[PDB]
Design a protein around this ligand. Sequence first.
Ligand code: NA
Ligand code: NA
Lengths: 99, 101
Amino acid sequence: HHVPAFLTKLWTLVSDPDTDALICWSPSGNSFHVFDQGQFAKEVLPKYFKHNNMASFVRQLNMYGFRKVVHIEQRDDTEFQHPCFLRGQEQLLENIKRK
Amino acid sequence: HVPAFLTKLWTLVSDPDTDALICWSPSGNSFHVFDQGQFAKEVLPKYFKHNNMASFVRQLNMYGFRKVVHIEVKPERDDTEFQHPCFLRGQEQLLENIKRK
DNA sequence: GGTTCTAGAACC
DNA sequence: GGTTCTAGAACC
Ligand code: NA
Ligand code: NA
């Protein structure tokens, strides 16, 4: 099936080293971080996910079955992941499904 | 030398006979612990005998495991998901790369 | 179960 | 060779 532009855009954005101050791969490449959501919403969303806020962006991640990664024991930092959303493996996006 | 905690955990997760309480995720990238009260009663005494649930989870944290949660209806039993990029179904040799953090 | 002891590894 | 770290065993 055709890979949703949402996922391709998201993957390219994460993978761009120049955006890493706001969104980047984890060291393992298995997850990605979103930093400083106040800034992320002003700088990033308007250009790559037009007419979105953080809530609608995160709703889309949930729709594609992304999970959140948190520390077991307790800038803002939120970590998301999908087993087919991986550093340097864009072709795996094909295996991501709605719901 | 891989710490016994990690080798025992990997074997325990992998064992189909314990899957009602502890098992791999479908992808093999994470494991689930179900029904922690029962896990503490049936599993910990046999596999991690000097531990309680708190110390078991502390050891996971010490080795850099994280928790996986849904982006936000209660399930029949509680379900906690843990993961480490070197703790994977079918890849026990990767435990060699797990370090204290 | 938490703390202490120590052999041996990790790292320089 | 010297220092720190770590895992397992004893001690509480
Ligand atoms: Na980036
Ligand atoms: Na199991």
